[PDB]
């Protein structure tokens, strides 16, 4: 008889005052972080070629 | 709460220190009955299955 829940809300339109305020899922949206350390580990690299590459 | 008549006197093993000995009348007299209500629910869950 028993089951858990399985459906992923990716976008959300909540009918915000007519013409729903649709919005995606923020956490579900992927995003990367630029290596600012490696960004600062490249130019100063003695191989300024390797680091700038 | 409410007045029920009572008397202070030891008697017959029902009164060691801390027993309260009321007789059958209030059980007939309903004096202090209880009525308690816990909540309940159900859910629908339009599923993948």
XYZ file of C-alpha atoms in Angstrom:
102
model
C 0.000 0.000 0.000
C 2.844 2.477 0.736
C 4.988 4.748 -1.490
C 7.118 7.913 -1.233
C 6.911 11.002 -3.466
C 8.666 11.303 -6.857
C 8.185 14.317 -9.133
C 10.662 17.171 -9.510
C 9.294 20.719 -9.673
C 11.656 22.391 -12.101
C 9.682 25.555 -12.799
C 7.032 27.149 -10.614
C 4.141 29.282 -11.797
C 1.945 30.053 -8.820
C -0.776 31.997 -10.630
C 0.578 35.150 -9.016
C -2.321 37.602 -9.409
C -3.346 36.342 -12.845
C -0.811 35.600 -15.553
C 1.148 33.356 -13.187
C 4.542 34.428 -11.884
C 6.396 31.473 -13.316
C 9.805 30.742 -11.878
C 12.201 27.878 -12.306
C 13.671 25.888 -9.452
C 16.760 27.778 -8.269
C 18.640 24.843 -6.735
C 17.871 22.631 -9.738
C 19.444 25.186 -12.079
C 23.104 24.145 -12.471
C 25.913 26.648 -12.039
C 29.707 26.495 -11.871
C 32.203 28.589 -9.941
C 35.205 29.936 -11.823
C 38.499 28.913 -10.278
C 39.497 32.348 -9.019
C 42.447 30.715 -7.263
C 43.583 29.153 -10.531
C 42.564 32.403 -12.218
C 45.195 33.884 -9.910
C 47.308 30.745 -10.287
C 47.773 31.247 -14.010
C 49.218 34.639 -14.884
C 51.828 34.586 -12.120
C 52.781 31.062 -13.166
C 56.400 31.190 -14.365
C 54.982 29.463 -17.406
C 52.859 32.544 -18.009
C 51.991 30.641 -21.178
C 50.680 27.643 -19.232
C 48.822 29.810 -16.738
C 47.401 32.197 -19.324
C 46.258 29.151 -21.301
C -13.330 22.644 39.899
C -16.180 21.989 42.161
C -17.208 21.113 45.690
C -17.359 17.466 46.614
C -17.914 16.743 50.301
C -15.080 14.870 52.030
C -13.865 13.742 55.444
C -10.356 13.397 56.921
C -9.903 10.189 58.836
C -7.780 7.030 58.453
C -9.596 3.839 57.425
C -8.961 0.255 56.502
C -5.817 0.301 54.409
C -7.167 2.590 51.754
C -5.429 5.559 53.321
C -1.683 4.792 53.703
C -0.530 8.313 52.817
C -1.639 9.470 49.395
C -4.744 7.714 48.180
C -7.922 9.678 47.464
C -10.955 7.557 48.367
C -14.240 8.676 46.833
C -17.249 6.364 46.805
C -19.590 5.305 44.007
C -21.790 8.413 43.964
C -19.694 10.711 41.812
C -19.169 7.813 39.418
C -22.901 8.010 39.200
C -22.800 11.784 39.687
C -20.502 12.386 36.731
C -18.886 15.053 38.874
C -15.860 15.837 36.692
C -16.203 13.864 33.433
C -13.798 14.255 30.493
C -14.140 15.087 26.761
C -11.029 15.289 24.569
C -10.553 15.519 20.787
C -7.452 14.630 18.772
C -7.168 15.656 15.114
C -6.944 13.593 11.917
C -6.530 13.944 8.153
C -5.805 12.386 4.764
C -3.868 13.241 1.590
C -4.258 12.598 -2.147
C -0.824 12.702 -3.852
C -1.241 12.683 -7.621
C 1.792 10.560 -8.354
C 4.132 9.268 -11.025
C 2.638 5.792 -10.557
